[PDB]
Design a protein around this ligand. Structure first.
Ligand SMILES: [Cl-]
Length: 526
């Protein structure tokens, strides 16, 4: 019967990166073999996009997962870079997060995308710990600290598409990316595109969504509905009443003031990483695209008004007077948090419809990729068994969100900043999740490790926690009774990292010099 009917009719409500990444990943996984669309494909995928003009952004970052997403969808890296105003991102550099700023005291550390050297052989972190006053964790275990300081790229012009010398994601223009995906998905992957409004959402007798009545395209029936409607969460949050779990009592930030910033020169250097520079009441992001930068101040309205926040943004930009008066930064207000589940009945939320917080550590596109790829890998056979799959997807989703909140909060909690109430408040226990409190206590006595994560395929590996914890000079009790053989392995791996760093520092291009050649010639396919 109906409950045994294969799930083939898939309706995505909303476009943007959330909707089109979903469409592409689903079509590529089920409907394409060796780049060829099946004559009679498994899935019939329709995307209904509002004809209303979308909110504009000023640049967004990704994780290295995006290389895989693009490749799976079937996008050529040169085409992507050229069409989406993209540059290479090798991690996040955190400036002035640790201490109240002093003019003669450098305060910066890197959270690189590269894993610690020799990670398959030995976790170097506890072997580095005794040497913390002599060398940074990131310098000791990876090459990206040194290479990104030098403004160098993660690969050479001779390196194959999506391959690397050091792991990388991207900085990109999201609207241009959505446009590229619309073209690819509709013209090459067989996705049906409808530009219209949804006037009614109709349920069947069991409370599943059965069909949508559009304003001018009639009734669109389906079996699985993807909510990509953004923060309004029209299907999952509103129609299905899935509760929202506010995380503002942890992160505080509920504002962003954003602006695009031209480079001073047509060939100004492009930064290798996202920059995050701490301020009295939040932090400022700085994302370098080839054509310009995107800058924004994330802040807490319960700590500062908007007038003062704007002044802080303008100070960071180095503008005042008449120059500042011509600037038009854009203000957004949110309740940071996530829906209790991403999948209810036959509806799964992807993107902001599921949750959203400040872009610290760039979780937004990573969650889109995770949710879409997971659905594509776990397409339910039918409605009868769907709840077994949605339950386990929801459990993993809940694990991810707990990890995101805790990981982001970690960045604040271990600061030594004292001058501002905002920073002092971030260290108070009522703002620290119990799960993170437990870790902070444990990590006084041992390094973060894979043992701290119970489940498969975490969004952030233990290394990310190490990079932040020790980037910010957190003290961990030294291991005792260290095994000489392992000390010797560690020393070999430290040496090897040093040698690799030196070799790469002499051979890799700057970002702009590389992007110039990508524009003109491109990376090879193989
Ligand atoms: Cl953007």
């Amino acid at each position: 019967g109906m409950m045994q009917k294969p799930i083939t009719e898939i309706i995505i409500v909303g476009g943007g990166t959330a909707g089109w990444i979903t469409a592409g990943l689903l079509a590529a996984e089920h409907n394409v073999d060796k780049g060829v669309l099946a004559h009679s494909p498994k899935l019939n995928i329709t995307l209904i996009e509002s004809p209303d003009v979308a909110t504009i952004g000023v640049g967004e970052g990704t994780w290295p997962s995006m290389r895989s997403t693009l490749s799976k969808i079937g996008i050529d890296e040169n085409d992507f870079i050229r069409q989406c105003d993209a540059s290479f991102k090798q991690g996040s550099r955190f400036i002035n997060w640790c201490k109240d700023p002093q003019s003669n005291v450098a305060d910066s550390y890197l959270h690189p995308f590269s894993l610690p050297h020799g990670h398959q052989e030995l976790d170097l972190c506890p072997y580095w710990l005794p040497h913390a006053e002599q060398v940074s964790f990131a310098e000791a275990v990876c090459s990206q600290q040194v290479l990104t300081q030098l403004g160098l790229a993660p690969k050479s012009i001779v390196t194959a598409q999506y391959h690397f010398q050091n792991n990388y994601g991207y900085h990109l223009n999201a609207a241009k990316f959505s446009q590229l995906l619309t073209e690819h998905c509709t013209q090459k992957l067989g996705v049906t595109h409808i530009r219209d409004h949804v006037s009614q959402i109709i349920n069947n007798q069991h409370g599943d969504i059965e069909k949508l009545i559009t304003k001018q395209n009639g009734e669109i029936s389906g079996q699985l509905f993807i909510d990509c409607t953004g923060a309004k969460s029209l299907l999952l949050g509103e129609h299905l009443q899935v509760p929202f779990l506010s995380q503002k009592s942890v992160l505080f930030n509920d504002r962003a003031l954003a602006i695009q910033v031209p480079y001073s020169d047509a060939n100004s250097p492009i930064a290798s990483c996202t920059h995050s520079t701490a301020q009295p009441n939040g932090w400022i992001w700085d994302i370098g695209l080839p054509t310009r930068k995107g800058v924004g101040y994330v802040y807490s309205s319960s700590h500062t008004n908007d007038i003062d926040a704007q002044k802080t943004l303008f100070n960071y930009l180095g503008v005042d007077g008449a120059a500042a008066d011509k600037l038009e930064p854009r203000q957004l207000a949110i309740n940071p948090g996530y829906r209790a589940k991403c999948w209810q009945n036959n509806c799964i939320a992807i993107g902001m419809a599921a949750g959203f917080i400040e872009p610290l550590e760039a979780s937004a596109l990573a969650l889109i990729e995770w949710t879409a790829s997971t659905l594509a890998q776990q397409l339910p056979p039918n409605r009868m068994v769907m709840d077994t799959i949605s339950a386990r997807v929801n459990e993993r989703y809940q694990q991810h969100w707990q990890q995101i909140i805790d990981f982001l909060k970690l960045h604040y909690v271990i600061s030594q900043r004292q001058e501002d109430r905002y920073w002092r408040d971030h260290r108070e226990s009522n703002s620290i999740p119990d799960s993170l409190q437990a870790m902070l206590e444990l990590w006084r006595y041992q390094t973060p490790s894979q043992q701290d994560i119970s489940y498969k395929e975490a969004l952030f590996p233990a290394a990310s926690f190490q990079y932040v914890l020790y980037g910010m000079s957190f003290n961990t009790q030294l291991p005792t009774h260290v095994k000489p053989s392992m000390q010797q392995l560690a020393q070999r791996l430290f040496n090897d990292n040093q040698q690799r760093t030196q070799a790469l520092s002499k051979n890799l291009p700057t970002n702009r010099e590389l992007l110039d050649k990508v524009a003109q010639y491109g990376f090879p396919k193989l």
